[PDB]
Amino acid sequence: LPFQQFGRDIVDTTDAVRDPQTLEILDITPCSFGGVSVITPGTNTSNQVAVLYQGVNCTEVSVAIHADQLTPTWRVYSTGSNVFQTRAGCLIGAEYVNNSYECDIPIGAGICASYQTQTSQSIIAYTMSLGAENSVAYSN
Amino acid sequence: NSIAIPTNFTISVTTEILPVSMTKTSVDCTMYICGDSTECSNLLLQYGSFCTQLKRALTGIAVEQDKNTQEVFAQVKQIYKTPPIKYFGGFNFSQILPDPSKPSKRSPIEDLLFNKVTKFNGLTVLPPLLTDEMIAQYTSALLAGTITSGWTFGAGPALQIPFPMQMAYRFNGIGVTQNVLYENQKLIANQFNSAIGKIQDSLFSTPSALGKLQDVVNHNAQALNTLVKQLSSKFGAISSVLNDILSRLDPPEAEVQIDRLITGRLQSLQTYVTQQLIRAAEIRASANLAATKMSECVLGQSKRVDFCGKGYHLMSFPQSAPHGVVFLHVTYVPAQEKNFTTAPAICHDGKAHFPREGVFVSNGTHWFLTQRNFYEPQIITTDNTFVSGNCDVVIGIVNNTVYDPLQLELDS
Amino acid sequence: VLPPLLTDEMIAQYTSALLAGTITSGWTFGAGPALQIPFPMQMAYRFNGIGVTQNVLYENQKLIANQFNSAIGKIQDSLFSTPSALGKLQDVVNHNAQALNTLVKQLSSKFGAISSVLNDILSRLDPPEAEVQIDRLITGRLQSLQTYVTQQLIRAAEIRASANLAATKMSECVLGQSKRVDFCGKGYHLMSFPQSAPHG
Amino acid sequence: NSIAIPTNFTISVTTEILPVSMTKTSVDCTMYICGDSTECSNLLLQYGSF
Amino acid sequence: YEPQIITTDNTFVSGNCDVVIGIVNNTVYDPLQLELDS
Ligand SMILES: *[C@@H]1O[C@H](CO)[C@@H](O[C@@H]2O[C@H](CO)[C@@H](O[C@@H]3O[C@H](CO)[C@@H](O)[C@H](O)[C@@H]3O)[C@H](O)[C@H]2NC(C)=O)[C@H](O)[C@H]1NC(C)=O
Ligand SMILES: *[C@@H]1O[C@H](CO)[C@@H](O[C@@H]2O[C@H](CO)[C@@H](O[C@@H]3O[C@H](CO)[C@@H](O)[C@H](O)[C@@H]3O)[C@H](O)[C@H]2NC(C)=O)[C@H](O)[C@H]1NC(C)=O
Ligand SMILES: *[C@@H]1O[C@H](CO)[C@@H](O[C@@H]2O[C@H](CO)[C@@H](O[C@@H]3O[C@H](CO)[C@@H](O)[C@H](O)[C@@H]3O)[C@H](O)[C@H]2NC(C)=O)[C@H](O)[C@H]1NC(C)=O
Ligand SMILES: *[C@@H]1O[C@H](CO)[C@@H](O[C@@H]2O[C@H](CO)[C@@H](O[C@@H]3O[C@H](CO)[C@@H](O)[C@H](O)[C@@H]3O)[C@H](O)[C@H]2NC(C)=O)[C@H](O)[C@H]1NC(C)=O
Ligand SMILES: *[C@@H]1O[C@H](CO)[C@@H](O[C@@H]2O[C@H](CO)[C@@H](O)[C@H](O)[C@H]2NC(C)=O)[C@H](O)[C@H]1NC(C)=O
Ligand SMILES: *[C@@H]1O[C@H](CO)[C@@H](O[C@@H]2O[C@H](CO)[C@@H](O)[C@H](O)[C@H]2NC(C)=O)[C@H](O)[C@H]1NC(C)=O
Ligand SMILES: *[C@@H]1O[C@H](CO)[C@@H](O[C@@H]2O[C@H](CO)[C@@H](O)[C@H](O)[C@H]2NC(C)=O)[C@H](O)[C@H]1NC(C)=O
Ligand SMILES: *[C@@H]1O[C@H](CO)[C@@H](O[C@@H]2O[C@H](CO)[C@@H](O)[C@H](O)[C@H]2NC(C)=O)[C@H](O)[C@H]1NC(C)=O
Ligand SMILES: *[C@@H]1O[C@H](CO)[C@@H](O)[C@H](O)[C@H]1NC(C)=O
């Protein structure tokens, strides 16, 4: 309404404002944030680690790396092959393969990581296997 | 001397709904308490490990929820598949087996269950490790296992058995002979199919059927909305927003008001985490019950009364649901009983004859031996009974002729 | 304090119904319709359950009935003589009484305030100071309530687990003949009978 | 080659005691913290949903 | 697996052959009859 100047959500956070000069209504989206998880094979095996940015798109992470915007000051080199989008978040330190295996170090949403020898060892990501297939020879 | 014995039976399928897991959350203690405030963070540092303890408690809960899901559903060593020919002795399992035409590959009942059950300041929600599709695959494997291999599925390799013979075993396991099933196989299959259709309609029609899972979703949504809502409180401060405190007050007064807001916000987080730990314990207990039910009701035939539904347990089928599991328990219910006159033993030539497997009954003129859970009179013979003692010690012994087959042959 | 929804008489009525079904039907009532059976035959099948033939019961029916009646009399004397037998239920009552006594005593605490009584704070201090002392007392009392509720939630979880065990035992040992070792007493299970008790 | 077999038996009756329910309580948060005090209740309102 | 001869001691009889959907034709060996005819 011409009267109202800003808006709030059901939990009383601010989600819209009226520009004081143009009277245009703008939505306010919180700036991207999330947890950071580090997948480590163990320091008695390898010093390579993978980093999961939880709850974000790999596009916003790439943009946040291009501009000096992302708060953590360390960077994981991106090779293209080591950037994989999961439902949990963006994993930028492991290669994704189409070979399923038993879950080792879980990531989430069906995706697990493990340290394996390359087709020379590296961290890989895969969709976890649930079990072997066995069609039962049922008959009358 | 009066005993009631069923002359008919009902195949009943009941629904048991159990929570297995709950929403996994994570909290950025600094962003929540001191969001985008350097001064607040510097005062927050004086509370030590408080954040670490809260983060650790929630991490432990998050891990526990995936453990609970794995324990309930990841009970199969192999992923079993049904045959392409869906003819299980005349029993129709189309409402419980995955429907290949649906991208989610859920059964009609699972699809119904999924359809009925319905970023904040420093708060996140973590996904489960096992996706809905993976849970559906475990449920499908469990159904294929039980349907095609019965009880052999859960205690070694799966061994195929014709479904009517699996049912014959299950009937024998409750004191009903195999011929009852085979003679009434069409009736039993029709009652099963009817019961499944009734369940589908019952769950569709009753909006409260899944309340046990909806309550978990609603309670966690309320906990998160309450925790966020607390950020607007003042706890005695001049304002709930830290930038107003720094703008209006001199540094040491701002520090006093900030400590006041910090205390209120950290108390809100401790309350949230404590409630989550209590709920996590409740969910774990539920998940442990669901895993026990899975092992004893689906991978076997439990003899525990009312554990796997009302009536004598025959079999059960899992179905997945959001944050939980739904079990369809198939039981045998006695019906249409008649009252017969009985006796503990038959007196023949001075010997006391007792049933080997059954109860002696009379229709008012003749004595027969019947199985206790289904009226089916048999001739009382020396093969069906055993002798112990004379016609004196047993109280209420009745005089009747016991037939001996060999003695009739001696006449031949 | 709120009363229970079911009265002691209603609980007694449920216990009586369960007992009448067990005595006159056996487990046929737990599984569906109640089918009458002579009690000695119900026992004969319970003997087959443990793995003893029917003729043992019938030849020793008088001995078995006498031992049963004696054992029940011994239970009545045991409960009468030993006051600690029911301590598990008394302890629940005692802990909740303690929790409420603790909760009310905390109202007298100052928590560092000038006085524990709000009316004294309001009568002795000008509002800008009274609000500080009152807020201190609010924090103390609110923390006391949070502590009470947390302890009640933990106790509630313990009671729920106990109630679930009691329901399982009634379903498996009253409405049936359990084969679980030591689930329902030492020895081979024959039968069980419920009795109502306060809060249990 | 030695087995012991019972020749007699005892029918024994034992007891098991289990809690089922506990005393139900209810607390008026405002009267407990701020009983019959308007100033306290008004301050209590600033703590939110507790 | 421990195959045994199908006999009248190892089985029981209920109903005729026209009810069971999967019933097959196979000789059941009676012990007493074999001695009596011999
Ligand atoms: C044992 O109980 C079952 C279930 O009650 C009995 O089967 C039922 O028998 C009745 C009468 O024959 C059936 O009713 C008929 O159904 C057809 C359906 O098209 C209808 O057109 C007829 O007018 C009549 O209503 C009933 O459907 C049937 N139920 C099932 C599940 O098959 C059975 O006969 C009983 N046996 C004994 C020995 O008591
Ligand atoms: C196993 O059971 C399912 C039902 O649980 C059977 O499928 C059902 O078959 C009937 C008759 O073929 C269908 O009824 C018809 O549906 C169409 C839908 O357009 C309607 O136009 C017709 O007037 C009639 O109502 C029913 O919808 C169908 N339901 C489902 C879910 O498929 C199935 O045939 C059974 N299989 C065996 C082998 O018995
Ligand atoms: C208790 O059960 C017995 C056994 O079923 C009942 O006796 C039997 O009754 C049937 C008729 O309902 C008799 O069948 C008929 O036998 C004559 C013989 O000539 C035959 O011509 C008929 O075509 C028919 O097959 C059967 O023989 C008879 N059995 C015996 C041993 O007498 C008895 O009536 C029942 N009593 C009560 C109170 O229910
Ligand atoms: C198995 O054990 C039971 C006891 O657990 C034996 O029954 C008991 O036998 C004794 C001696 O025969 C009875 O004692 C007598 O009782 C009468 C009561 O009037 C008394 O006048 C006698 O002077 C003597 O004290 C005892 O009461 C009896 N118990 C019961 C419950 O009947 C049974 O004989 C044993 N059987 C075997 C085969 O060992
Ligand atoms: C006062 O506010 C009005 C809008 O509420 C301003 O009007 C617009 O100013 C921009 C300046 O680039 C123009 O492009 C728009 O066309 C103006 N609006 C209209 C309807 O013409 C106005 O300029 C503001 N004045 C001051 C001094 O700030
Ligand atoms: C088991 O037997 C059933 C018949 O009772 C078979 O199903 C029939 O299959 C034929 C084709 O060969 C169809 O024309 C019939 O309509 C089917 N009947 C029913 C009731 O579905 C079934 O295929 C047999 N199973 C196997 C593995 O051979
Ligand atoms: C069962 O049959 C026996 C004999 O076959 C009956 O025994 C008789 O019992 C009475 C009881 O007073 C005696 O007076 C007779 O002398 C007994 N006769 C014989 C031959 O022993 C027995 O009573 C019968 N039981 C029933 C219930 O009828
Ligand atoms: C089992 O044996 C019976 C005979 O004892 C068979 O029944 C006969 O089957 C033939 C088949 O052409 C018919 O012409 C006869 O009329 C039937 N007689 C009777 C009395 O039913 C039966 O088919 C055999 N079953 C199998 C599976 O071989
Ligand atoms: C990531 O962003 C791109 C932007 O085009 C979008 O198409 C894609 O679906 C997004 N992925 C996720 C997982 O949000």
Numbering used by the authors:
A (entry chain B): 558 to 676, 687 to 707
B (entry chain C): 710 to 827, 854 to 1147
C (entry chain A): 860 to 1059
D (entry chain A): 710 to 759
E (entry chain B): 1108 to 1145
Per the authors:
We investigate how mutations and a deletion in the KP.3.1.1 spike protein (S) affect hACE2 binding and antibody escape. The spike proteins exhibited three conformational states: “one RBD up,” “all RBD down,” and “flexible” (i.e., one or two RBDs disordered in the density maps due to flexibility).
JN.1.11 is JN.1 plus V1104L, and JN.1.11.1 is JN.1.11 plus F456L. The N30 site (NxT motif) was found to be predominantly occupied with high-mannose glycans. Similarly, JN.1.11 + S31Δ, JN.1.11.1 + S31Δ, and JN.1.11 + Q493E + S31Δ also shared similar NTD structures with KP.3.1.1. Using 3D variability analysis, we quantified the particle proportion for each conformational state and found that S31Δ did not affect the proportions of “one RBD up” and “all RBD down” particles by comparing the proportion of JN.1.11 and other spike proteins that have S31Δ. The data from three paired variant sets (JN.1.11 & JN.1.11 + S31Δ, JN.1.11.1 & JN.1.11.1 + S31Δ, and JN.1.11 + Q493E & JN.1.11 + Q493E + S31Δ) showed that S31Δ has little impact on hACE2 binding, which is consistent with previous studies. Besides, while F456L alone did not affect hACE2 binding (JN.1.11.1 has F456L compared to JN.1.11), Q493E alone substantially reduced binding affinity, which is also consistent with prior research and is likely due to the electrostatic repulsion between hACE2-E35 and RBD-E49317. In addition, other spike mutants with Q493E retain BD55-1205 binding, while F456L resulted in a binding affinity decrease where the only mutation of JN.1.11.1 is F456L compared to JN.1.11.
